[PDB]
Design an enzyme around this catalytic site. Structure first.
Site, PDB file in Angstrom:
ATOM      1  N   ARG G  48      22.587 109.906  51.559  1.00  0.00           N
ATOM      2  CA  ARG G  48      23.649 110.751  52.087  1.00  0.00           C
ATOM      3  C   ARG G  48      24.238 111.586  50.962  1.00  0.00           C
ATOM      4  N   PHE G  53      31.824 115.030  48.659  1.00  0.00           N
ATOM      5  CA  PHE G  53      32.662 114.014  49.287  1.00  0.00           C
ATOM      6  C   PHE G  53      32.073 112.618  49.143  1.00  0.00           C
ATOM      7  N   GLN G  56      25.753 108.705  48.803  1.00  0.00           N
ATOM      8  CA  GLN G  56      25.196 107.380  49.031  1.00  0.00           C
ATOM      9  C   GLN G  56      23.716 107.390  48.685  1.00  0.00           C
ATOM     10  N   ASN G  95      27.679 101.996  54.977  1.00  0.00           N
ATOM     11  CA  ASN G  95      27.884 101.491  56.330  1.00  0.00           C
ATOM     12  C   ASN G  95      28.168 102.686  57.236  1.00  0.00           C
ATOM     13  N   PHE G 106      27.611 104.225  47.294  1.00  0.00           N
ATOM     14  CA  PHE G 106      28.178 105.512  47.667  1.00  0.00           C
ATOM     15  C   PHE G 106      29.296 105.861  46.697  1.00  0.00           C
ATOM     16  N   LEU G 115      35.774 107.681  55.622  1.00  0.00           N
ATOM     17  CA  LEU G 115      34.680 106.757  55.362  1.00  0.00           C
ATOM     18  C   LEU G 115      35.156 105.388  54.894  1.00  0.00           C
ATOM     19  N   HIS G 119      33.245 102.136  56.167  1.00  0.00           N
ATOM     20  CA  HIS G 119      32.342 101.667  55.129  1.00  0.00           C
ATOM     21  C   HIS G 119      33.092 100.732  54.194  1.00  0.00           C
TER      22      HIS G 119
END
Ligand code: ZN
Ligand code: ZN
Lengths: 48, 320, 295, 35, 149, 66, 159, 241
Positions: G48, G53, G56, G95, G106, G115, G119
């Protein structure tokens, strides 16, 4: 030279006379860039 | 630093005269029974390979014939001229049966695919055109060279099209898109001739700068052969690896293909009634037997050399 | 001297839901090179169909290359993400793209970007997709989500405008009387709507978007404590604390049921002003519609 | 040019077949085995 | 937890910034770019008896020949269709905003109909491909005797 | 492109000869030489051909040998 | 056992010494330390990549929703108040689904409270936060995944 | 007078475009058009003119030099850095581009990344002037060990007796007399040891005369044993000293 400048001055006088009183599909050089080729950027250039 | 092999040298054994124009190109019949010369007299002259007698002479190009090729699997003659035209000739009727027209400038060279049987024609308008043979239609137009394309190689391996132009660049083309994939700027001078080795998946390029050997398909730069640094108009390679480089000053330089070692430097003579400026090699070509060398000289002669068979390794030593 | 723009010969017109209609069972017609583009004048692929019942038999106006440039509808000429004009979206996000006005330079630059899209992936609204993700700042206060069928409504019967439509209801054009011709909203130059320059619908929606104080707030005299009316006891201090935890630290999160005031105050004045601009009749905290005012 | 509708009389379909070399015409099947 | 426009830098670990990404501009990674001193230097001479220094043989040559022949025959048939004088599909549109079934049908193009638009448009040509890095040997500077030579 | 017909023989022949002169003059130039003077070489060649037409002994002693 | 209060990671992007809040998320810290000991998240691509921002990387599925964790398939997203995705240098578990946390790390150098609730945060990156921000500032495609894949070279799961 | 200036600019731009369409190869019309746009303060239009001139012909040195010079004279310093980066990555064999970019990014820029770029050119291996200028830029950045490594790289790339004597003099001036004596010994045993020119030996004798003159007498005796008149004069000077 001087005759062409006098003819351009007379054409400008006729242009102001017509403005006081189409474009034939031309390319307007002053209004925008005639052909735009953008410069590449790399590792720099936050511009101005 | 490997010791180079000994290719035996060559000796001139026959000289053919009779053209009233510069012998621009030499093609050989693939069964090695005769050959043919396209001249600057706009004459396509079939000559006997053995006797050397003038079998036939043909006209029809309004300008100078730049290229002559005879198809190896079809009984057809493809002659490109400088009249922006390519003529396909049926030799059974000995007539121009087909016409290839559409190049905007004078055509300087042509090539055919050995299996696909498609035409590529490099011309003076900095372009090549890829034509279907039967329908005479330019299904492609290769462009990207800025100067006029001197020579084109059409091979069955990858890449198929190798164009050498006068803008010091070599373009290597993906055929199925009609697009260049490799461009080599490494020559300092005009790329006027290229020669492919038939088996080693490699080629070489002759220029007034140097000679450059590369390797297919990415054009990986193998070797730089210095020497014979004149305007190399033509190139050929033997199955032995005997590289003949012929320039516009009339000198033959003969090399090993692998090591690049120049084993022979021979300057030929001229015609009796001729200038000293009329010594310039337009086409060097081996026969199909790889035993006779045909050089197309600028004094309107064809000089065919034999192997110097009396040579030995100690009479002709390999330097370093 | 052998230069021209190639022809838009492709399927898949990229259309709005509004012009797309309501029927899932759609019959379709496609002309290959029937008309030309209304902007760059390339011969494009015409897509004509009937979305519903009371219809204009709507069809595409500009080429697919122009639609790929501007992310607008091929018929409605409004932006596909929000239903808004491209003047509104360019004022909202980025207006540095523009287009040349001369025909030769426009066709040459159009050929250049057409070569660029042909070398690109194919489904991309060119370069400002990377800067157009920052949306719903203010333009989604008035951006349409409903499929608007009153613009898909067919043209006006000019014969019954003259009073002489002898067909009556058999005439498929609209037997209602027209709009005001003196109204500048009725002018609607198609090239102006493409270029994003002085579109009267875009100016009317910008004038409308200047009316609501959706992010004004700040009624407290240099105080971070903004009282959100309309909250009541449904919005507690925990919702304001969870809202201000993203902006930093909450100086004062409270709920007063006497005045129905959610007292929100971040530790930073800029964070408190950002939370008040979010909650000034534009945010809901714990299921309660908050409207920021003095606290 | 993919779009032209002008047809010259030298652009007509003609000589559409390609003759090939037979074994009397020095075919490439015998070119390989011949030395 | 306890705290509460340039170009992309392409570093291949030890190599400090790959300048091949500056050497290509709009060119994709499939095109070979000779841009380094490693690209400039030649290879040493070695054994020609080498499958690297050999053809990829008649099977790969014939497969390339067949694929190129099929693509070129497709191009020839396209040229015949473009130069020689003379179904109701069920697709799904996903608007991503519901999904619809389109009975994709074409219309009857009229042969009793002239050409529509003028195709003799003379505009100046577009920009070419981005230029290659000009690899050459280091230059031999001419003397003044060479300059008035 | 137009065919090279009978009225266009000599003009296209001299044009191709001049293009061959340009391609065969651009290639022995070494590094340097801003004044390539290909127009001057064309004037020298035209004067040489005119003097051969006139049977005049044409010689410019300032002229490089190849 | 393998409960790392801090973890060191040296790769092509740089060296990051991220302190993992083992007192806040003990099960997530044990899963991350055992996955770093077993090499589960090492060498996998950067899954990700949001616009500066959240970055991950280390998911075995490569999408950011999967990833093989050492707590048994996907680890439990056990968020805590001491470990929340906020501030500069926030380390989290990938997550993207409910109670499905991968072993991918992340990096969030900005406030990531959207998040944080979905997460589990591994801890606060006290060192290498600038390198984590420089890794996460690289733009990606529409699926938050660029063409370039960022792998892991060497990892020290101390604790 | 604004409409008169617009008509004059239209006429001048039309004549410039007519000169371009008459001769696209002649870059003087492009250069005068770009400088006319710069005089009319159309900097982005002049940048477009320079970009189209480079698209027509990128192989001119003066186009890149002019467009970098106008970007440096204006506020387009980062754009000038982009110009220099493109000019280097298209033409890495043009010495003036390297020299002018490193001068601009060392005076206006003052960038040690420009010295790293100039060391990338040292990995393209230029002539001796560029290696000595990188030595002098290391001395201007006040790192004598850096310049010692640069001169060692120059001795590795282009080995010369004068290069090794310059390395010995640089190590002597960089307060490393042991490294200067080691450089003199490596010049004697490496730089033309099979050639035996007796000039690196004379430089080693001069360095040993600076250090301890018994080693100078031994070096002069060894040079006279290995060698002529200069070696005999050096041995006589070592005997008289
Ligand atoms: Zn629509
Ligand atoms: Zn359009």
């Amino acid at each position: 030279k001087a005759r062409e400048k006098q003819l351009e001055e007379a054409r400008r006088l006729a242009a102001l006379q017509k403005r006081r009183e189409k474009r034939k599909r031309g390319v307007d050089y002053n209004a925008e860039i005639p052909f735009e080729k953008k410069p590449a950027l790399g590792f720099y250039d936050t511009s101005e | 630093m490997p010791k180079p092999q000994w290719h035996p040298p060559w000796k001139l054994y026959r000289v053919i005269s009779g053209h009233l124009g510069w012998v621009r190109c030499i093609a050989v019949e693939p069964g090695n029974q005769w050959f043919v010369t396209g001249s600057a007299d706009r004459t396509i002259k079939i000559w006997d390979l053995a006797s050397g007698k003038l079998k036939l002479s043909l006209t029809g190009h309004i300008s100078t014939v730049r290229g002559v090729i005879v198809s190896t699997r079809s009984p057809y003659l493809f002659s490109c001229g400088e009249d922006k035209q390519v003529k396909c000739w049926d030799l059974e009727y000995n007539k121009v049966i087909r016409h290839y027209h559409g190049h905007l400038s004078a055509v300087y060279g042509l090539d055919l695919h050995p299996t696909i049987d498609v035409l590529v024609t490099c011309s003076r308008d900095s372009t090549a055109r890829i034509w279907d043979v039967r329908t005479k239609a330019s299904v492609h137009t290769l462009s990207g060279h800025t100067n006029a394309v001197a020579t084109v190689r059409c091979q069955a391996a990858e890449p198929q099209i190798i164009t050498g132009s006068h803008d010091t660049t070599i373009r290597l083309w993906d055929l199925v898109a009609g697009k260049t994939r490799v461009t080599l700027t490494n020559h300092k001078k005009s790329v006027r001739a290229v020669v492919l080795h038939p088996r080693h998946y490699t080629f070489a390029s002759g220029s007034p700068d140097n000679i450059k050997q590369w390797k297919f398909p990415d054009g990986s730069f193998i070797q730089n052969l210095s020497g014979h640094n004149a305007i190399i108009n033509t190139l050929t390679v033997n199955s032995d690896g005997v590289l003949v480089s012929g320039a516009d000053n009339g000198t033959m330089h003969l090399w090993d293909w692998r090591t690049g070692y120049n084993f022979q430097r021979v300057h030929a003579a001229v015609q009796p009634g001729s200038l000293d400026s009329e010594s310039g090699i337009f086409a060097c070509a081996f026969d199909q037997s790889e035993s006779r060398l045909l050089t197309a000289e600028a004094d309107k002669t064809i000089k065919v050399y034999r192997e110097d068979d009396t040579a030995t390794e100690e009479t002709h030593p390999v330097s370093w | 001297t052998y230069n021209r723009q190639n022809w838009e010969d492709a399927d898949f017109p990229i259309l709005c839901q509004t012009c797309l209609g309501e029927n899932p069972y759609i019959r379709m017609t496609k002309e290959k090179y029937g008309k030309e583009c209304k902007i760059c004048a390339r011969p494009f692929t015409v897509f004509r169909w009937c979305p519903g019942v009371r219809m204009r038999f709507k069809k595409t106006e500009v080429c697919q290359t122009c639609s790929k440039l501007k992310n607008v509808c091929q018929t409605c000429l409004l932006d596909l993400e929000y239903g808004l004009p491209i003047q509104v979206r360019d004022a909202g996000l980025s207006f540095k793209d523009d287009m040349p006005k001369s025909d030769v330079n426009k066709e040459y630059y159009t050929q250049n970007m057409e070569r660029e899209i042909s070398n690109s992936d194919g489904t991309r609204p060119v370069g400002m997709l990377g800067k157009a993700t920052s949306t719903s700042d203010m333009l989604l206060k008035l951006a349409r989500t409903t499929p608007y069928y009153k613009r898909n409504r067919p043209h006006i019967c000019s014969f019954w405008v003259k009073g002489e439509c002898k067909r009556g209801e058999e005439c498929p054009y609209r037997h209602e009387k027209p709009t005001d011709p003196d109204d500048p909203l009725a002018d609607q130059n198609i090239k102006d709507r493409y270029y994003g320059i002085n579109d009267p619908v875009a100016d009317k929606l910008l004038k409308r978007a200047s009316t609501m104080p959706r992010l004004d707030p700040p009624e407290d005299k240099t105080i971070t404590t903004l009282y959100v009316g309309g909250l009541g006891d449904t919005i507690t201090e925990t919702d304001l604390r969870n809202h201000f935890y993203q902006f930093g630290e909450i100086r004062t999160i409270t709920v007063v049921q006497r005045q129905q005031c959610a007292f929100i105050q971040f530790a930073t004045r800029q964070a408190a002003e950002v939370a008040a601009e979010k909650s000034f009749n534009k945010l809901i905290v714990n299921g309660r519609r908050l409207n920021v005012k003095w606290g | 040019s993919q779009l032209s509708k002008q047809y010259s009389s030298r652009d007509l379909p003609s000589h559409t077949k390609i003759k090939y070399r037979q074994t009397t015409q020095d075919a490439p099947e015998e070119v390989r085995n011949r030395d | 937890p306890e705290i509460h426009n340039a170009l992309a830098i392409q570093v291949d670990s030890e190599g400090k910034i790959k300048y091949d990404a500056i050497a290509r501009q709009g060119q994709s990674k499939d095109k070979v770019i000779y841009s380094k001193y490693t690209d400039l230097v030649p290879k040493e001479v070695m054994n020609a008896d080498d499958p690297d220094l050999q053809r990829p043989d008649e099977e790969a040559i014939k497969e390339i020949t067949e694929k190129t022949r099929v693509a070129l025959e497709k191009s020839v048939s396209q040229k015949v269709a473009a130069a020689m004088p003379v179904p109701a599909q069920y697709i799904r549109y996903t608007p991503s905003q519901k999904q619809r079934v389109i009975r994709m049908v074409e219309m009857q193009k009229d042969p009793m109909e002239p050409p529509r638009f003028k195709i003799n448009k003379k505009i100046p040509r577009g920009p070419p491909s981005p230029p290659a890095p000009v690899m050459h040997s280091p230059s031999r500077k001419m003397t003044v005797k060479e300059q008035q030579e | 492109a137009k065919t090279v017909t009978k009225q266009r023989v000599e003009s296209h022949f001299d044009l191709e000869l001049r293009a061959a002169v340009m391609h065969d003059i651009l290639d022995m130039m070494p590094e340097g030489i801003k004044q390539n003077k290909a127009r001057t070489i064309l004037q020298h060649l035209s004067e040489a051909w005119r003097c051969w037409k006139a049977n005049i002994p044409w010689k410019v002693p300032g002229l490089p040998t190849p | 056992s393998w409960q790392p209060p801090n973890v060191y990671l040296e790769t092509s992007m740089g060296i990051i010494v991220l302190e993992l809040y083992w007192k806040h998320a003990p099960k997530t810290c044990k899963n991350f330390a055992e996955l770093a000991r077993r090499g589960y998240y090492n060498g996998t691509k950067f899954h990700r990549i949001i616009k500066d921002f959240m970055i991950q990387g280390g998911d075995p599925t490569g999408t950011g929703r999967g990833g093989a964790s050492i707590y048994g398939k996907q680890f439990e997203d056990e968020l805590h108040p001491d470990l929340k995705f906020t501030g500069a240098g926030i380390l989290a578990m990938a997550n993207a689904g409910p109670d499905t946390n991968g072993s991918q790390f992340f990096v969030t150098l900005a406030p990531t409270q959207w998040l944080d609730g979905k997460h589990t945060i591994f801890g606060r990156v006290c060192q290498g936060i600038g390198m984590v921000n420089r890794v996460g500032m690289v733009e990606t495609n529409s699926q938050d995944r660029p063409v370039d894949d960022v792998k892991i070279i060497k990892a020290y799961p101390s604790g | 007078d604004e409409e008169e200036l617009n008509d004059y600019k239209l006429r001048k731009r039309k004549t410039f475009e007519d000169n371009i369409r008459k001769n696209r190869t002649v870059i003087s019309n492009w250069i005068k058009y770009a400088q006319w746009e710069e005089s009319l303060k159309e900097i982005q239009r002049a940048r477009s003119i320079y970009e189209r001139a480079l698209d027509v012909d990128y192989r001119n040195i003066t186009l890149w030099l002019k467009y970098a010079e106008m970007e440096m004279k204006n506020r387009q310093v980062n754009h000038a850095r982009n110009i220099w980066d493109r000019a280097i990555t298209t033409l890495p064999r043009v010495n003036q581009f390297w020299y002018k970019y490193t001068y601009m990014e060392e005076m206006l820029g003052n960038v040690a990344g420009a010295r790293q770029v100039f060391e990338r050119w040292m990995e393209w291996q230029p002539e001796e002037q560029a290696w000595h200028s990188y030595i002098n830029f290391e001395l201007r950045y006040k790192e004598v060990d850096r310049a010692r490594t640069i001169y060692e790289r120059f001795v590795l790339v282009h080995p010369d007796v004068k290069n090794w004597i310059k390395y010995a003099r640089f190590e002597e001036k960089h307060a490393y007399f042991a490294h200067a004596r080691k450089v003199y010994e490596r010049a004697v045993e490496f730089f033309g040891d099979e050639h035996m020119d007796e000039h690196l030996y004379v430089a080693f004798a001069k360095f040993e005369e600076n250090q301890k003159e018994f080693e100078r007498v031994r070096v002069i005796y060894k040079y006279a044993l290995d060698r002529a008149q200069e070696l005999f004069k050096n041995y006589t000077i070592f005997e008289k000293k």
